[PDB]
Amino acid sequence: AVGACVLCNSQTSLRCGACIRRPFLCCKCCYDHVISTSHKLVLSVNPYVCNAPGCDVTDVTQLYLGGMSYYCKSHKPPISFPLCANGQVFGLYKVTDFNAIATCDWTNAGDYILANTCTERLKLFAAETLKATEETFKLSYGIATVREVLSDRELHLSWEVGKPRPPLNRNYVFTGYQIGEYTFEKDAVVYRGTTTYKLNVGDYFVLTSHTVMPLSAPTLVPQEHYVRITGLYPTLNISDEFSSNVANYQKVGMQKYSTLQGPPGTGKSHFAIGLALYYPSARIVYTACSHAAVDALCEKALKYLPIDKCSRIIPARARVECFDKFKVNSTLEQYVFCTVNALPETTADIVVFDEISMATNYDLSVVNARLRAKHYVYIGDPAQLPAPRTLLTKGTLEPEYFNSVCRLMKTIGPDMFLGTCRRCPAEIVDTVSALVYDNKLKAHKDKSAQCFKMFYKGVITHDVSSAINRPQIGVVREFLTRNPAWRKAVFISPYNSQNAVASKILGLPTQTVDSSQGSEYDYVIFTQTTETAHSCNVNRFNVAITRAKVGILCIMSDRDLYDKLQFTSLEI
Numbered sequence: 001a002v003g004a005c006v007l008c009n010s011q012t013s014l015r016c017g018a019c020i021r022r023p024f025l026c027c028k029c030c031y032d033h034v035i036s037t038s039h040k041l042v043l044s045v046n047p048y049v050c051n052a053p054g055c056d057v058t059d060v061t062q063l064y065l066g067g068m069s070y071y072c073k074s075h076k077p078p079i080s081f082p083l084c085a086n087g088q089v090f091g092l093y094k095v096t097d098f099n100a101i102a103t104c105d106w107t108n109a110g111d112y113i114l115a116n117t118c119t120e121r122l123k124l125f126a127a128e129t130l131k132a133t134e135e136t137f138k139l140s141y142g143i144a145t146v147r148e149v150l151s152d153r154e155l156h157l158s159w160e161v162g163k164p165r166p167p168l169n170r171n172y173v174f175t176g177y178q179i180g181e182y183t184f185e186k187d188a189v190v191y192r193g194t195t196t197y198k199l200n201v202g203d204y205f206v207l208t209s210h211t212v213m214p215l216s217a218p219t220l221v222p223q224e225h226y227v228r229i230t231g232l233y234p235t236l237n238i239s240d241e242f243s244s245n246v247a248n249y250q251k252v253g254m255q256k257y258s259t260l261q262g263p264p265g266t267g268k269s270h271f272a273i274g275l276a277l278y279y280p281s282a283r284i285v286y287t288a289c290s291h292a293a294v295d296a297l298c299e300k301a302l303k304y305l306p307i308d309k310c311s312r313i314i315p316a317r318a319r320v321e322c323f324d325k326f327k328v329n330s331t332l333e334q335y336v337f338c339t340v341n342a343l344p345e346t347t348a349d350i351v352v353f354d355e356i357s358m359a360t361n362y363d364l365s366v367v368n369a370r371l372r373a374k375h376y377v378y379i380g381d382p383a384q385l386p387a388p389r390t391l392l393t394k395g396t397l398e399p400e401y402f403n404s405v406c407r408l409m410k411t412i413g414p415d416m417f418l419g420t421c422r423r424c425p426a427e428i429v430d431t432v433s434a435l436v437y438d439n440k441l442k443a444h445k446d447k448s449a450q451c452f453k454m455f456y457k458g459v460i461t462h463d464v465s466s467a468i469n470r471p472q473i474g475v476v477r478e479f480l481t482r483n484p485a486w487r488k489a490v491f492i493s494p495y496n497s498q499n500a501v502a503s504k505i506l507g508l509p510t511q512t513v514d515s516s517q518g519s520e521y522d523y524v525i526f527t528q529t530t531e532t533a534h535s536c537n538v539n540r541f542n543v544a545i546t547r548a549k550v551g552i553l554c555i556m557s558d559r560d561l562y563d564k565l566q567f568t569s570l571e572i
């Protein structure tokens with residue numbers, strides 16, 4: 001009941017009872033909150049409420065201290081003090097940004113902007129408030145009850161009337177009734193049980209609404225610049241493979257934390273694993289938000305680091321199949337590979353946090369809270385995709401507001417930049433370099449002359465709000481009959497429903513742009529499907545076309561992005 005003010009750190013007994021997270025406010029700050037917002041309930045040891053029997057006055061501005069107790073104007077004794085006076089709320093030990101964070105519904109981009117341009121304590125209140133709000137919004141969706149079971153991969157669902165139906169992709173994971181987590185995709189709907197269970201009729205599904213725990217650690221610890229490599233011991237015997245990164249590896253050792261911007265295929269994993277070879281005795285925790293990113297770091301480790309000094313940390317509530325070739329759940333191994341949400345409370349000489357564009361300020365905080373480290377290294381690319389903000393419907397979130405790390409990389413620049421793409425044909429490297437990298441990304445590969453674009457708006461149908469463009473899929477089908485080397489292509493679109501249709505008609509494997517991030521394929525076919533903010537987003541577009549190692553076909557809806565593709569154009 002007695003703590004420190006979230007704005008100025010001053011001691012007080014005051015918490016805002018109106019704020020969903022009930023944050024400590026000092027007398028000066030608590031006043032400035034209640035006087036300029038609809039927030040009027042103050043909490044102490046006891047609520048600031050009129051103590052007169054049957055009185056309903058809870059608004060601190062209308063209340064007085066008489067003796068040791070509180071009363072309104074109607075009930076206060078002659079000798080009483082207003083609780084709100086001289087810019088203060090009476091409490092023990094006697095802001096425009098805090099008010100917007102406390103009261104916003106998180107549906108506007110401006111809300112996320114403010115949560116990332118504010119002071120460090122307000123980043124934490126914002127992150128916890130946002131996350132709390134995101135969780136309570138899951139409760140709003142309807143229960144999904146199994147009407148009938150068709151097959152091992154398809155059933156028919158019945159949806160609770162009076163509540164809306166959640167989007168049916170992989171981004172929305174359900175819990176069966178506890179018969180294991182389940183996902184659904186498009187009457188016949190396709191089910192996927194994590195645990196292989198004989199799906200019974202009447203069993204129901206609900207989105208997991210986990211309680212949002214307080215935060216405590218900053219998103220970033222304060223920066224420290226050292227004169228010499230601190231707490232780490234280099235080799236004088238580094239493999240030529242990692243020679244290029246030695247100066248950057250020395251920078252990692254001479255700062256508290258460092259940022260690395262690595263555009264697609266520029267050697268991020270190679271850098272991360274190479275850090276262990278350069279500081280061979282250092283204990284390194286490798287972390288990312290997703291099991292995929294952590295597995296990708298494991299695959300690289302398997303090739304270059306001693307397998308007996310690596311462990312893959314898997315939570316006992318295992319949701320996806322992940323990396324099997326390390327000792328599982330040996331926290332004390334030199335090399336620990338673990339999702340942010342599963343991190344143990346431990347220490348490390350180096351923490352490597354990968355795919356940083358996908359992290360929230362909540363994730364950055366948790367990592368600082370669970371891991372006490374000599375050095376923190378943040379790897380990714382703010383020109384790639386952020387974590388989906390399920391509440392944000394109005395405005396676009398710019399890369400400089402993704403999290404504290406992306407904000408530094410977009411403002412003062414990253415500490416280190418991997419400048420040569422070794423994955424993509426020059427046509428793709430030249431396009432994205434100009435689009436999101438200020439012409440600083442260089443091609444290693446030649447032009448493949450297997451990069452084509454076709455401008456074809458087609459016809460846009462919708463499966464609810466998910467878009468479909470059958471004529472664009474028809475153009476692809478026609479191209480495949482004339483280009484049989486592309487039979488092996490991965491089909492990519494900004495929409496699951498487009499992918500579902502392409503799957504049946506083309507038989508190609510299928511990938512959303514968001515699910516494709518971190519992966520690479522010889523040949524990619526991309527149908528833009530629609531001209532929307534979603535489908536024209538330059539980060540999404542960057543990821544989409546940089547998946548390709550040899551060839552890409554882009555069927556485009558947007559003139560601007562069509563014209564910027566430095567590709568051979570096809571007719572029909």
Ligand SMILES: CCNC(=O)c1ccc(NS(C)(=O)=O)cc1
Nearest residue numbers: 006021023121124125128215216
């Ligand atoms: C060293 C203590 N940490 C902080 O500075 C802090 C932690 C959480 C916050 N979020 S809350 C409870 O929702 O206000 C705010 C500030």
Ligand SMILES: [Zn+2]
Nearest residue numbers: 016018019039
């Ligand atoms: Zn409040």
Ligand SMILES: [Zn+2]
Nearest residue numbers: 005008026029
């Ligand atoms: Zn204060």
Ligand SMILES: [Zn+2]
Nearest residue numbers: 050055072075
């Ligand atoms: Zn009263």
